[PDB]
Amino acid sequence: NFNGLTGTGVLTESNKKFLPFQQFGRDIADTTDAVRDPQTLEILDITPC
């Protein structure tokens, strides 16, 4: 439950360069592909189990 976004999946350290003004990432069909932690601001990749 990331700042309100609720879902399921495996969290992995991201390797894509989020710009400092971005907070979320999306694949095709509005699928949330990545998210940054609201606490440590690290980018995380979301993959369905």
């Binding site: 976004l5 609720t6 095709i28 069909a29 509005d30």
Partner: protein, 48 residues
């Protein structure tokens, strides 16, 4: 000359590439139709 005819013309196998393109397009549109709200408040059952 058969090989030259197949090499010079890139669109020679279009009748065979068309089915693959159609299948890919069908799958792509079926995947993209998930973002449709269909009149609902949102397109994500999690948020709903």
């Amino acid at each position: 000359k058969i090989q030259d005819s197949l090499s010079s013309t890139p669109s020679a196998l279009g009748k065979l590439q068309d089915v693959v393109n159609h299948n890919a397009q069908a799958l792509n549109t079926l995947v993209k139709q998930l973002s449709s709200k269909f009149g609902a408040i949102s397109s994500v059952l999690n948020d709903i």
